[PDB]
CSV table of C-alpha atoms in Angstrom, one decimal:
chain,number,residue,atom,x,y,z
A,1,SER,CA,-2.3,-3.3,17.1
A,2,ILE,CA,-2.5,0.3,15.7
A,3,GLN,CA,-5.8,2.0,16.6
A,4,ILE,CA,-6.5,5.7,15.9
A,5,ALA,CA,-9.7,7.7,16.1
A,6,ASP,CA,-8.6,11.4,16.0
A,7,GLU,CA,-10.6,14.4,14.9
A,8,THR,CA,-9.7,17.9,13.6
A,9,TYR,CA,-12.0,20.9,13.2
A,10,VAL,CA,-11.7,22.4,9.6
A,11,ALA,CA,-13.4,25.8,8.9
A,12,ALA,CA,-14.5,24.7,5.4
A,13,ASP,CA,-17.4,22.7,3.8
A,14,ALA,CA,-17.5,19.0,3.3
A,15,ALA,CA,-17.3,19.2,-0.5
A,16,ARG,CA,-13.9,21.0,-0.4
A,17,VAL,CA,-12.6,18.8,2.5
A,18,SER,CA,-13.5,15.5,0.7
A,19,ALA,CA,-11.8,16.8,-2.5
A,20,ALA,CA,-8.5,17.5,-0.6
A,21,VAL,CA,-8.7,14.1,1.2
A,22,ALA,CA,-9.4,12.2,-2.0
A,23,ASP,CA,-6.2,13.5,-3.9
A,24,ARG,CA,-4.3,10.2,-4.6
A,25,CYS,CA,-1.0,12.2,-4.9
A,26,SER,CA,-1.6,13.5,-1.3
A,27,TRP,CA,-2.1,9.8,-0.1
A,28,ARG,CA,1.5,9.2,-1.3
A,29,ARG,CA,2.9,12.2,0.6
A,30,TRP,CA,0.8,11.5,3.8
A,31,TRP,CA,1.4,7.7,4.0
A,32,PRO,CA,4.6,6.9,2.1
A,33,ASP,CA,4.9,3.3,3.4
A,34,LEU,CA,1.1,2.4,2.9
A,35,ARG,CA,-0.7,1.2,-0.2
A,36,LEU,CA,-4.3,2.2,-0.2
A,37,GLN,CA,-7.2,0.6,-2.2
A,38,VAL,CA,-10.7,2.3,-2.0
A,39,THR,CA,-13.3,-0.2,-0.7
A,40,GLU,CA,-16.0,2.6,-0.1
A,41,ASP,CA,-16.3,5.9,-1.9
A,42,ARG,CA,-18.6,8.1,0.3
A,43,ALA,CA,-18.6,11.3,-1.9
A,44,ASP,CA,-18.7,14.4,0.4
A,45,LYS,CA,-18.7,12.4,3.7
A,46,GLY,CA,-15.2,10.8,3.1
A,47,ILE,CA,-13.5,7.5,2.1
A,48,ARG,CA,-12.7,4.0,3.4
A,49,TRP,CA,-9.6,2.1,2.3
A,50,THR,CA,-8.1,-1.4,2.7
A,51,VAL,CA,-4.4,-0.9,3.8
A,52,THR,CA,-1.4,-2.9,2.6
A,53,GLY,CA,2.4,-2.1,2.8
A,54,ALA,CA,3.9,-1.4,6.2
A,55,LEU,CA,0.5,-2.0,7.9
A,56,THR,CA,-2.5,-4.3,6.9
A,57,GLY,CA,-6.0,-3.3,8.0
A,58,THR,CA,-8.5,-0.6,7.4
A,59,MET,CA,-8.3,3.2,7.3
A,60,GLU,CA,-11.1,5.7,6.9
A,61,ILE,CA,-11.8,9.5,6.9
A,62,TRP,CA,-15.4,10.4,7.8
A,63,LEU,CA,-16.6,14.1,7.7
A,64,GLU,CA,-19.5,15.6,9.7
A,65,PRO,CA,-20.7,19.2,9.9
A,66,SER,CA,-19.7,21.1,13.2
A,67,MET,CA,-19.5,24.7,14.2
A,68,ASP,CA,-18.5,26.8,11.0
A,69,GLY,CA,-17.1,23.7,9.2
A,70,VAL,CA,-16.5,19.9,9.7
A,71,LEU,CA,-15.0,17.4,12.0
A,72,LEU,CA,-12.5,15.3,10.0
A,73,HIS,CA,-12.4,11.9,11.7
A,74,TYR,CA,-9.2,10.0,11.0
A,75,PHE,CA,-9.6,6.2,11.7
A,76,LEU,CA,-6.9,3.4,11.5
A,77,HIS,CA,-7.2,-0.2,12.6
A,78,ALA,CA,-4.1,-2.1,11.3
A,79,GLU,CA,-1.4,-4.6,12.2
A,80,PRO,CA,2.3,-4.6,11.2
A,81,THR,CA,2.2,-6.6,8.0
A,82,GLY,CA,3.2,-10.3,8.0
A,83,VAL,CA,5.3,-10.0,11.2
A,84,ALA,CA,6.3,-13.0,13.3
A,85,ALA,CA,5.5,-13.0,17.0
A,86,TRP,CA,9.3,-12.4,17.8
A,87,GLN,CA,9.2,-9.2,15.7
A,88,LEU,CA,6.0,-7.9,17.2
A,89,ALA,CA,7.6,-8.4,20.7
A,90,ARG,CA,10.4,-6.0,19.8
A,91,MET,CA,8.1,-3.2,18.6
A,92,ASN,CA,7.1,-0.2,20.7
A,93,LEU,CA,3.4,-0.1,19.6
A,94,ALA,CA,2.7,3.1,21.6
A,95,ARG,CA,5.6,5.0,19.8
A,96,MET,CA,4.3,3.6,16.4
A,97,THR,CA,0.8,4.7,17.2
A,98,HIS,CA,2.1,8.2,18.2
A,99,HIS,CA,4.0,8.4,14.8
A,100,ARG,CA,0.9,7.4,12.8
A,101,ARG,CA,-1.1,10.0,14.8
A,102,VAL,CA,1.4,12.7,14.0
A,103,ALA,CA,1.1,11.6,10.3
A,104,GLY,CA,-2.7,11.8,10.6
A,105,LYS,CA,-2.3,15.4,12.0
A,106,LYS,CA,0.1,16.4,9.2
A,107,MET,CA,-2.7,15.3,6.8
A,108,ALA,CA,-5.3,17.4,8.7
A,109,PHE,CA,-3.0,20.5,9.1
A,110,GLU,CA,-2.2,20.4,5.3
A,111,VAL,CA,-5.9,20.0,4.5
A,112,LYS,CA,-6.7,22.9,7.0
A,113,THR,CA,-4.1,25.5,5.9
A,114,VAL,CA,-4.9,24.9,2.2
A,115,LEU,CA,-8.7,25.0,2.5
A,116,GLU,CA,-8.7,27.9,5.1
B,1,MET,CA,20.1,-7.1,-11.0
B,2,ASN,CA,18.4,-6.1,-7.6
B,3,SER,CA,17.8,-2.8,-5.7
B,4,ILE,CA,20.1,-4.0,-2.8
B,5,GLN,CA,23.3,-5.9,-3.7
B,6,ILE,CA,26.0,-6.7,-1.1
B,7,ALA,CA,29.2,-8.8,-1.4
B,8,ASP,CA,31.4,-8.2,1.7
B,9,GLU,CA,34.2,-10.3,3.4
B,10,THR,CA,35.6,-10.4,6.9
B,11,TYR,CA,38.5,-12.5,8.2
B,12,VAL,CA,37.7,-14.7,11.3
B,13,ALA,CA,40.6,-16.6,12.9
B,14,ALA,CA,38.6,-19.7,13.8
B,15,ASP,CA,37.8,-23.1,12.4
B,16,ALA,CA,35.3,-23.2,9.6
B,17,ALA,CA,33.0,-25.5,11.7
B,18,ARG,CA,32.8,-23.0,14.6
B,19,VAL,CA,32.2,-20.0,12.2
B,20,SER,CA,29.5,-22.0,10.2
B,21,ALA,CA,27.8,-23.0,13.5
B,22,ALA,CA,27.7,-19.4,14.7
B,23,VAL,CA,26.2,-17.9,11.5
B,24,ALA,CA,23.6,-20.8,11.3
B,25,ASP,CA,22.2,-19.9,14.8
B,26,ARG,CA,18.5,-19.1,14.2
B,27,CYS,CA,18.3,-16.9,17.4
B,28,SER,CA,21.3,-14.8,16.3
B,29,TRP,CA,19.5,-14.1,13.0
B,30,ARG,CA,16.8,-12.2,15.0
B,31,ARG,CA,19.4,-10.0,16.6
B,32,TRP,CA,21.3,-9.4,13.4
B,33,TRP,CA,18.3,-8.9,11.1
B,34,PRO,CA,15.3,-8.0,13.2
B,35,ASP,CA,13.2,-6.8,10.2
B,36,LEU,CA,14.0,-9.9,8.1
B,37,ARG,CA,12.5,-13.5,8.3
B,38,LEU,CA,15.0,-16.1,7.0
B,39,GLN,CA,14.3,-19.6,5.6
B,40,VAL,CA,17.2,-22.0,5.0
B,41,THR,CA,17.4,-23.2,1.4
B,42,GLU,CA,20.8,-25.0,1.9
B,43,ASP,CA,23.0,-25.8,4.9
B,44,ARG,CA,26.5,-26.4,3.5
B,45,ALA,CA,28.2,-27.3,6.8
B,46,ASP,CA,31.8,-25.8,7.0
B,47,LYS,CA,31.1,-23.8,3.8
B,48,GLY,CA,28.2,-21.7,5.2
B,49,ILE,CA,24.5,-21.3,4.4
B,50,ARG,CA,22.0,-20.1,1.9
B,51,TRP,CA,18.7,-18.4,2.8
B,52,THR,CA,15.6,-16.9,1.2
B,53,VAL,CA,14.7,-13.6,2.8
B,54,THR,CA,11.2,-12.2,3.5
B,55,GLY,CA,10.0,-9.4,5.8
B,56,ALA,CA,11.3,-5.9,5.0
B,57,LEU,CA,13.3,-7.3,2.0
B,58,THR,CA,12.5,-10.2,-0.5
B,59,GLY,CA,15.4,-12.0,-2.0
B,60,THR,CA,18.4,-14.3,-1.3
B,61,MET,CA,21.2,-14.1,1.3
B,62,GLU,CA,24.3,-16.3,1.7
B,63,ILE,CA,27.3,-16.9,3.8
B,64,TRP,CA,30.3,-18.6,2.2
B,65,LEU,CA,33.5,-19.5,4.0
B,66,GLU,CA,36.9,-19.7,2.2
B,67,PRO,CA,39.9,-20.9,4.2
B,68,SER,CA,42.6,-18.2,4.7
B,69,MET,CA,45.4,-17.6,7.2
B,70,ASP,CA,44.4,-19.2,10.6
B,71,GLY,CA,40.7,-19.3,9.8
B,72,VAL,CA,38.2,-18.3,7.1
B,73,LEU,CA,37.0,-15.4,5.0
B,74,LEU,CA,33.3,-15.0,6.0
B,75,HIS,CA,31.6,-13.9,2.7
B,76,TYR,CA,28.3,-12.1,3.3
B,77,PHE,CA,26.0,-11.8,0.2
B,78,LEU,CA,22.6,-10.2,-0.1
B,79,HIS,CA,20.4,-9.6,-3.3
B,80,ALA,CA,17.0,-8.3,-2.5
B,81,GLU,CA,14.2,-5.8,-3.1
B,82,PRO,CA,12.1,-3.8,-0.6
B,83,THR,CA,9.1,-6.2,-0.1
B,84,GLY,CA,5.9,-5.6,-2.0
B,85,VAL,CA,6.5,-1.9,-2.8
B,86,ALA,CA,4.7,-0.1,-5.7
B,87,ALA,CA,6.9,1.5,-8.4
B,88,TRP,CA,6.0,4.9,-6.9
B,89,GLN,CA,7.4,3.9,-3.5
B,90,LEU,CA,10.6,2.4,-5.0
B,91,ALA,CA,11.2,5.5,-7.1
B,92,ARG,CA,11.2,7.6,-3.9
B,93,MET,CA,13.7,5.4,-1.9
B,94,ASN,CA,17.4,6.2,-1.4
B,95,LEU,CA,18.7,2.7,-2.5
B,96,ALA,CA,22.4,3.8,-1.8
B,97,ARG,CA,21.6,4.7,1.8
B,98,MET,CA,19.5,1.5,2.2
B,99,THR,CA,22.4,-0.6,0.8
B,100,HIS,CA,24.8,1.1,3.2
B,101,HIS,CA,22.6,0.3,6.2
B,102,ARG,CA,22.3,-3.3,5.1
B,103,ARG,CA,26.1,-3.5,4.6
B,104,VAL,CA,26.7,-2.1,8.2
B,105,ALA,CA,24.2,-4.7,9.6
B,106,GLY,CA,26.1,-7.5,7.7
B,107,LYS,CA,29.4,-6.4,9.0
B,108,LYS,CA,28.0,-6.2,12.6
B,109,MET,CA,27.1,-9.8,12.3
B,110,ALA,CA,30.6,-10.7,10.9
B,111,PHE,CA,32.4,-8.7,13.6
B,112,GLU,CA,30.2,-10.3,16.4
B,113,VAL,CA,31.1,-13.8,15.1
B,114,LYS,CA,34.8,-12.7,14.9
B,115,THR,CA,34.7,-11.3,18.4
B,116,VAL,CA,33.0,-14.3,20.1
B,117,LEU,CA,35.1,-17.0,18.3
B,118,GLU,CA,38.5,-15.2,18.6
B,119,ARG,CA,37.9,-14.3,22.3
B,120,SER,CA,40.8,-15.4,24.6
B,121,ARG,CA,40.4,-17.5,27.8
B,122,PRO,CA,38.2,-16.0,30.7
B,123,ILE,CA,40.2,-14.9,33.8
B,124,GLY,CA,40.6,-17.4,36.7
B,125,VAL,CA,38.8,-20.2,34.8
B,126,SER,CA,40.6,-23.5,34.0
B,127,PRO,CA,42.9,-24.1,32.3
B,128,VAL,CA,45.3,-21.3,33.6
B,129,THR,CA,48.6,-21.2,31.6
């Protein structure tokens, strides 16, 4: 129900980007209503989580070299957790997606301004 | 002891059977508590209803009706936690503000029931007196 595949250019190397992205205290600030359990540690190419809390599904950051730095891919595929059909019918999934994209872009901008 | 605790009362000038029927309406619960899922543990007829709560909160919720004046005092009770949260998430919540919002929602339910059941005759509908 929430599907994101965004990308942000960061003028810095994969090692430093993966370190900023892997800070567990940052996960709390970036996704306050999600619990994240690592299902795949991918060292300098990013991280894959199983997502619980407000959403249930999968989230992933994947890094690849581009121009003078990396593309930071932000992926989410998740559904509002445990909701009944009557609750899902009342949700504005496009608004919800937009908010989760703005939150993804907060995460990228903080990683950017720090590492640049 | 629970993160969210509510005990509020509202006077409704209507028969306990009508007030109990109104608060027991499953479709009304979706309007009053759209982020909650309720399961009936006990229907106590003219005395109200007891629920378990899931969804955004996990806990118990009750309505109790005590005769007073020309009707009943509609008691609204909630004891619950934010569902499934980690201790780091709970530690960052404003439980006072969350409790306020849940009290306002409970009082909106009570005032809707009060409004609908106390409402006087429609205009130009029988009987006209």
